[PDB]
Design a protein around this ligand. Structure first.
Ligand SMILES: [Mg+2]
Ligand SMILES: [Mg+2]
Ligand SMILES: [Mg+2]
Ligand SMILES: [Mg+2]
Ligand SMILES: [Mg+2]
Ligand SMILES: [Mg+2]
Ligand SMILES: [Mg+2]
Ligand SMILES: [Mg+2]
Ligand SMILES: [Mg+2]
Ligand SMILES: [Mg+2]
Ligand SMILES: [Mg+2]
Ligand SMILES: [Mg+2]
Ligand SMILES: [Mg+2]
Ligand SMILES: [Mg+2]
Ligand SMILES: [Mg+2]
Ligand SMILES: [Mg+2]
Ligand SMILES: [Mg+2]
Ligand SMILES: [Mg+2]
Ligand SMILES: [Mg+2]
Ligand SMILES: [Mg+2]
Ligand SMILES: [Mg+2]
Ligand SMILES: [Mg+2]
Ligand SMILES: [Mg+2]
Ligand SMILES: [Mg+2]
Ligand SMILES: [Mg+2]
Ligand SMILES: [Mg+2]
Ligand SMILES: [Mg+2]
Ligand SMILES: [Mg+2]
Ligand SMILES: [Mg+2]
Ligand SMILES: [Mg+2]
Ligand SMILES: [Mg+2]
Ligand SMILES: [Mg+2]
Ligand SMILES: [Mg+2]
Ligand SMILES: [Mg+2]
Ligand SMILES: [Mg+2]
Ligand SMILES: [Mg+2]
Ligand SMILES: [Mg+2]
Ligand SMILES: [Mg+2]
Ligand SMILES: [Mg+2]
Ligand SMILES: [Mg+2]
Ligand SMILES: [Mg+2]
Ligand SMILES: [Mg+2]
Ligand SMILES: [Mg+2]
Ligand SMILES: [Mg+2]
Ligand SMILES: [Mg+2]
Ligand SMILES: [Mg+2]
Ligand SMILES: [Mg+2]
Ligand SMILES: [Mg+2]
Ligand SMILES: [Mg+2]
Ligand SMILES: [Mg+2]
Ligand SMILES: [Mg+2]
Ligand SMILES: [Mg+2]
Ligand SMILES: [Mg+2]
Ligand SMILES: [Mg+2]
Ligand SMILES: [Mg+2]
Ligand SMILES: [Mg+2]
Ligand SMILES: [Mg+2]
Ligand SMILES: [Mg+2]
Ligand SMILES: [Mg+2]
Ligand SMILES: [Mg+2]
Ligand SMILES: [Mg+2]
Ligand SMILES: [Mg+2]
Ligand SMILES: [Mg+2]
Ligand SMILES: [Mg+2]
Ligand SMILES: [Mg+2]
Ligand SMILES: [Mg+2]
Ligand SMILES: [Mg+2]
Ligand SMILES: [Mg+2]
Ligand SMILES: [Mg+2]
Ligand SMILES: [Mg+2]
Ligand SMILES: [Mg+2]
Ligand SMILES: [Mg+2]
Ligand SMILES: [Mg+2]
Ligand SMILES: [Mg+2]
Ligand SMILES: [Mg+2]
Ligand SMILES: [Mg+2]
Ligand SMILES: [Mg+2]
Ligand SMILES: [Mg+2]
Ligand SMILES: [Mg+2]
Ligand SMILES: [Mg+2]
Ligand SMILES: [Mg+2]
Ligand SMILES: [Mg+2]
Ligand SMILES: [Mg+2]
Ligand SMILES: [Mg+2]
Ligand SMILES: [Mg+2]
Ligand SMILES: [Mg+2]
Ligand SMILES: [Mg+2]
Ligand SMILES: [Mg+2]
Ligand SMILES: [Mg+2]
Ligand SMILES: [Mg+2]
Ligand SMILES: [Mg+2]
Ligand SMILES: [Mg+2]
Ligand SMILES: [Mg+2]
Ligand SMILES: [Mg+2]
Ligand SMILES: [Mg+2]
Ligand SMILES: [Mg+2]
Ligand SMILES: [Mg+2]
Ligand SMILES: [Mg+2]
Ligand SMILES: [Mg+2]
Ligand SMILES: [Mg+2]
Ligand SMILES: [Mg+2]
Ligand SMILES: [Mg+2]
Ligand SMILES: [Mg+2]
Ligand SMILES: [Mg+2]
Ligand SMILES: [Mg+2]
Ligand SMILES: [Mg+2]
Lengths: 113, 202, 50, 117, 101
RNA sequence: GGGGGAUGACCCCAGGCGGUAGGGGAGCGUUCCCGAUGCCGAUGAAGGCCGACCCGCGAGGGCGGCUGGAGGUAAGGGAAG
RNA sequence: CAGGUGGAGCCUGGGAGUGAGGGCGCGAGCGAUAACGUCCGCGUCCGAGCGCGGGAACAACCGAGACCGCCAGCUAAGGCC
RNA sequence: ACCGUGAGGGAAAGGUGAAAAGAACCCCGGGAGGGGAGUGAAAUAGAGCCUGAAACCGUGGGCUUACAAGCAGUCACGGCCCCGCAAGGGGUUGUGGCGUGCCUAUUGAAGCAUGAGCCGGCGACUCACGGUCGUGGGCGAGCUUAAGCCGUUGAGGCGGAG
């Protein structure tokens, strides 16, 4: 079986957090944890939460044994945009968009004997 | 056309008639078109850039703004602006020549009489504003409602009767129009109604 | 006779008004107006019959 | 009655985009760039049928002119041989003869520089 | 053994047991037709003149039809001129049965 | 265009068929009306997404599957935002 | 007076567009027996043939007027180490 | 709402489902969010809720690419993958041949002349009354009514001033 957790409307830029997600793809849960703890990014925190919430769905909802699950799949999609006004010189007003991500960690049991 | 049946209470006699030998499947069409058009309401409308609610101010200056050039926001190019050559209320009626109105009416009957889908009648029997009464008379006239029927009489109670039949269109005799003949498969008149018809024409 | 059986004479309605729609029709883009100045302009020419 | 664009526009745009499958970048994704790209592929097709006929002849001829250059013969001559001998057959197409049926080919050459020597 | 034939103003290499599409003919889809035309035999020496006479090859009108549609389009730029035309080239399928020669 | 008298729509026959501004002629599709107290539709409408299939020169029309969940509307004519 | 049946001609009408042309050859004027200059006349091509072949490449020079298809043949200009 | 001292300007923004039956409880989490359970004919109908197109951004897979050069396509062959007995077809692109975007404006543009970031939706030859040709019909030494009056399930007829 495979299990997944999704953090949605997370107030962070996709392109930013996608960077650490790609860092755990295909790895054991044991390793992945050790990676996020010392990855120096704001995205670590969030991805950590999603991952741990995914495991906590495998063992308690799908029977998967924590010692055998890897990061089968992981991705982050673009949530809706927070458009905000940025006042500029000569009365301009730009619009910066505070971006938003949909983090999706998806776990599976390693095919170990 | 000539040979038309009559339901006398006595026996199904025949009555000859001076109806047009041939028909013009165009002036019939020209008449129907005229009917269906004079009855339109011409009630679609829209607002030009002048009747739209926006102010007549100019959006930006003509030049040096670095955008396109514009007047009001009622201009047709603007979303929410007025429309161009859209519908206004109009009268679709036109005065079709009277001779053609008459002639088409004869022809519309002749086309019925020719196919022997005309039947004249008298007095009825089951009259009185109950369809049940009518419906049996009709049954006893080969009008099983196997086909759409235009019933023409000046008898209120007879018109009251059949009025609710999903295959009957009822009409007083001065209301003889041709649209209400071509839809109907079958034409049925009382004699006093046939009489006036022979007077409208000629 | 029947309503489906109406239909007028082949000429008659004619309809098929002209346009200024696409290419292919031929009568497209400039719509019968040619590159032009005063006449390709909206309101048009002065009364040409005089 | 109003008649909105409605569904007509999306549909036409899909025909083109479908005909532009496999084109590079936007040329397959943007309607406008796809239509533009198509006109090109349109004329290039037409032009390249009319000139595919050309390209093969020039290919056929080389092989002939090489194969009969193994028997001491210009292509320029050979054709006259076949012209005269009435062997108006090679159609240059059947210079697969020169590769599959050398025996046959030789006979023709032999018959070619026969009449006219 | 093979032969070189001629039809549709073209000249193909046939050999008994060979389905082959050809410029449309006039015969019943399942008739029988020799094209009394030949220009070669797969045993040499037959070659001479345009067409060798003491020889021909027979085939069965396997059926007719229309080949795949190709789009021939034309575009002239800056002149608002585009044409779309669909083409399907009629053809007849033939089976080479005998080299009568 | 001429025959084929087939008056039809059908055949052989011979010609013409680059094209802007423009002229002319045929059609496709969109909204609405009559056809409708009808017909299609939960055994699935309209719309969407595919298709290497079928008919049309083309504009288009079909057909098949997936989606969709309540509408749609022939032949044949009419009017246009 | 004859040959000439041609997308020829003439008559009456409906609808236009165009009225910024350009290059080249030949005949002149202006210019400097200058200009991808200018202004006429006779032709032509481009315009509208920025479709094809040749000219290395190139609207108008040479060849040639592209309805569609073919992995058939002869050619024009031009070429064949 | 917002903009403007003011006169005044002036928007955007509708749709779960038949019915809230609007998700008790449990797990991860500070919450948000999710995973189970549960409701439902359907939960990518879960309330940023019918349908959910395109641009746009990701994940996974097939083909491909680091001695090549280009309006990005086309025409050939060939490799690799896929569908199908089958011949055949679909995807991809390695090499070879050919190839100066679209619109507009112009004598002339790939043009280093104009316009367009891309996508979706709104966006320009109409109508009335006259007139002039043509055309489909009616009646023809005649043709025709206007306003009105009568009638009428969207029924027509009378009305001859002009
Ligand atoms: Mg300031
Ligand atoms: Mg105003
Ligand atoms: Mg106003
Ligand atoms: Mg206002
Ligand atoms: Mg003002
Ligand atoms: Mg700008
Ligand atoms: Mg409005
Ligand atoms: Mg009136
Ligand atoms: Mg009146
Ligand atoms: Mg009724
Ligand atoms: Mg027309
Ligand atoms: Mg139009
Ligand atoms: Mg036209
Ligand atoms: Mg034109
Ligand atoms: Mg005009
Ligand atoms: Mg101008
Ligand atoms: Mg213009
Ligand atoms: Mg001008
Ligand atoms: Mg003016
Ligand atoms: Mg529109
Ligand atoms: Mg392709
Ligand atoms: Mg020869
Ligand atoms: Mg011999
Ligand atoms: Mg070009
Ligand atoms: Mg031009
Ligand atoms: Mg005939
Ligand atoms: Mg011909
Ligand atoms: Mg031609
Ligand atoms: Mg033409
Ligand atoms: Mg014409
Ligand atoms: Mg239509
Ligand atoms: Mg109805
Ligand atoms: Mg059901
Ligand atoms: Mg279904
Ligand atoms: Mg609809
Ligand atoms: Mg289709
Ligand atoms: Mg569907
Ligand atoms: Mg309808
Ligand atoms: Mg219709
Ligand atoms: Mg419009
Ligand atoms: Mg003469
Ligand atoms: Mg002429
Ligand atoms: Mg004129
Ligand atoms: Mg001038
Ligand atoms: Mg001049
Ligand atoms: Mg000139
Ligand atoms: Mg000149
Ligand atoms: Mg010359
Ligand atoms: Mg000279
Ligand atoms: Mg000059
Ligand atoms: Mg000079
Ligand atoms: Mg011009
Ligand atoms: Mg010319
Ligand atoms: Mg050029
Ligand atoms: Mg060129
Ligand atoms: Mg050249
Ligand atoms: Mg030059
Ligand atoms: Mg040239
Ligand atoms: Mg040229
Ligand atoms: Mg030659
Ligand atoms: Mg020569
Ligand atoms: Mg050379
Ligand atoms: Mg303020
Ligand atoms: Mg205020
Ligand atoms: Mg607004
Ligand atoms: Mg909505
Ligand atoms: Mg509801
Ligand atoms: Mg509701
Ligand atoms: Mg806890
Ligand atoms: Mg706290
Ligand atoms: Mg939940
Ligand atoms: Mg259930
Ligand atoms: Mg479902
Ligand atoms: Mg369903
Ligand atoms: Mg769920
Ligand atoms: Mg469930
Ligand atoms: Mg769905
Ligand atoms: Mg749903
Ligand atoms: Mg949304
Ligand atoms: Mg939804
Ligand atoms: Mg609903
Ligand atoms: Mg949705
Ligand atoms: Mg999408
Ligand atoms: Mg990928
Ligand atoms: Mg090197
Ligand atoms: Mg390499
Ligand atoms: Mg490079
Ligand atoms: Mg390339
Ligand atoms: Mg393939
Ligand atoms: Mg391939
Ligand atoms: Mg190459
Ligand atoms: Mg290539
Ligand atoms: Mg090249
Ligand atoms: Mg432009
Ligand atoms: Mg300009
Ligand atoms: Mg200029
Ligand atoms: Mg200039
Ligand atoms: Mg540039
Ligand atoms: Mg400039
Ligand atoms: Mg430019
Ligand atoms: Mg300018
Ligand atoms: Mg911008
Ligand atoms: Mg658009
Ligand atoms: Mg008028
Ligand atoms: Mg008029
Ligand atoms: Mg009244």
């Amino acid at each position: 079986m495979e299990a997944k957790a999704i953090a949605r409307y997370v107030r962070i830029s996709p392109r930013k957090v996608r960077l650490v997600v790609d860092l755990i793809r295909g790895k054991s849960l044991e390793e992945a944890r050790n990676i996020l703890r010392y990855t120096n990014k704001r995205g670590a925190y969030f991805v950590a939460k999603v991952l741990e919430s995914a495991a906590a769905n495998a063992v308690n909802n799908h029977d998967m044994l924590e010692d055998r699950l890897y990061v089968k799949a992981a991705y982050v999609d673009e949530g809706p945009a927070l458009k905000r006004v940025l006042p500029r010189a000569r009365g301009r007003a730009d619009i910066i968009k505070k971006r938003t991500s949909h983090i999706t960690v998806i776990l599976g049991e390693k095919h170990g004997k | 056309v000539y040979q038309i049946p009559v339901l006398s209470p006595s026996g199904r006699r025949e009555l000859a008639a001076d109806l047009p030998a041939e028909i013009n499947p165009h002036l019939l069409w020209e008449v129907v078109r005229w009917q269906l058009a004079k009855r339109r309401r011409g009630t679609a409308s829209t607002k030009t850039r002048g009747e739209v609610a926006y102010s007549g101010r100019k959006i930006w200056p003509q030049k040096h703004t670095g955008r396109a050039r514009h007047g009001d926001i009622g201009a047709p190019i603007f979303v929410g602006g007025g429309v161009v050559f859209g519908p206004k209320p109009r009268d679709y009626s036109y005065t079709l020549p009277k001779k053609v109105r008459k002639k088409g009416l004869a022809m519309a009957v002749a086309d019925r009489a020719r196919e022997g889908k005309l039947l004249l009648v008298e007095a009825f029997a089951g009259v009185n504003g109950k369809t049940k009464e009518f419906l049996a008379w009709a049954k006893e006239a080969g009008l099983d409602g196997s086909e759409s029927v235009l019933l023409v009489t000046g008898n209120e109670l007879v018109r009251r009767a059949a009025r609710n039949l999903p295959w009957v269109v009822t009409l007083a005799p001065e209301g003889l129009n041709v649209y209400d003949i071509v839809r109907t498969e079958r034409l049925v008149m009382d004699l006093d109604a046939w009489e006036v018809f022979q007077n409208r024409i000629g | 006779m029947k309503l489906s059986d109406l239909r007028p004479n082949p000429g008659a309605n004619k309809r098929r008004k002209r346009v200024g729609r696409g290419p292919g029709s031929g009568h497209g883009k400039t719509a019968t107006r040619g590159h032009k100045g005063q006449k390709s302009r909206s309101g048009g020419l002065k009364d040409p019959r005089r | 009655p109003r008649a909105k664009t409605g569904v007509v526009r999306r549909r036409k745009h899909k025909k083109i985009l479908k005909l532009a499958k496999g084109y590079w970048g936007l040329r397959s994704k943007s309607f406008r760039k796809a239509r533009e790209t198509l006109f090109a592929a349109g004329n290039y097709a037409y032009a390249h049928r009319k000139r595919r006929k050309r390209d093969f002849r020039r290919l056929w001829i080389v092989r002939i002119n090489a194969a009969c250059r193994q028997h001491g013969l210009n292509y320029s001559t050979f054709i006259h041989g076949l012209k005269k001998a009435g062997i108006e057959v090679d159609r240059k197409n059947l210079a697969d003869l020169a590769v599959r049926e050398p025996q046959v080919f030789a006979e023709l050459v032999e018959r070619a520089k026969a009449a006219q020597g | 053994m093979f032969a070189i034939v001629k039809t549709g103003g073209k000249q193909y290499r046939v050999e008994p047991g060979l389905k082959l599409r050809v410029e449309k003919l006039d015969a019943e889809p399942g008739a029988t037709v020799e094209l009394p035309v030949l220009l070669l035999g797969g045993e040499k020496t037959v070659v001479g003149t345009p067409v060798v006479e003491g020889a021909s090859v027979v085939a069965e009108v396997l059926g007719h039809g229309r080949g795949k549609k190709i789009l021939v389009s034309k575009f002239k730029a800056k002149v608002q001129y585009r044409r779309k035309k669909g083409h399907r080239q009629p053809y007849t399928e033939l089976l080479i049965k005998e080299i009568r020669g």
